[PDB]
Amino acid sequence: MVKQIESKTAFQEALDAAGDKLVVVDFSATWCGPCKMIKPFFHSLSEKYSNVIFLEVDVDDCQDVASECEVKCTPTFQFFKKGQKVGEFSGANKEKLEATINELV
């Protein structure tokens, strides 16, 4: 189930309530258009992969979290596990998310 973050204190609990299963994050802009044009791709995995947790950070109201990952270009996909970063790749690519998840699955 995709989840939207709003602050850092939250970004923490999310990784604490996500158990240990893969935890992929979508650092992109929700207000922008072209950035949300790739949503029907990362937001559709909500029902497909029910064994994985997905998040969605808004680099507009959650710059604290973004500035935490030192991002400098959206959309940026990150991979967190047990609350520890293990993979991260940016670029408007979808066919990659799949195989990528198959990486740490």
| Three-class SS of 20-77 | CCCEEEEEECCCCCCCHHHHHHHCCHHHHCCCCEEEEEECCCCHHHHHHHCCCCCCEE
CB 64 within 8 A of CB 58: no
| DSSP code at position 85 | E
Q: Report the CATH architecture of 1-105.
A: 3-Layer(aba) Sandwich (3.40)
Q: Find where tokens 């990784």 sit.
A: 15
Q: What technique solved it?
A: NMR
CB atoms within 10 A of CB 7: 12
Which residue among 32, 62, 69, 73 is the active-site one? 32
Block residue for tokens 């973050």: 5
| Residue 103 per-residue DSSP state | H
- The dihedral of CA 13, 16, 18, 23: what is its sign? positive
Domain ranges of the chain: 1-105
- Report residue 68 as tokens: 């935490």
Which listed residue (35, 62, 69, 73) is catalytic? 35
Q: Is 35 a catalytic residue?
A: yes
Q: What are the residues whose beta carbons fall under 8 Å from the beta carbon of 70, sequence distance 6 or more?
A: none
Contact criterion met (CB below 8 Å) for 56 and 4: yes
Q: Is 32 considered catalytic here?
A: yes
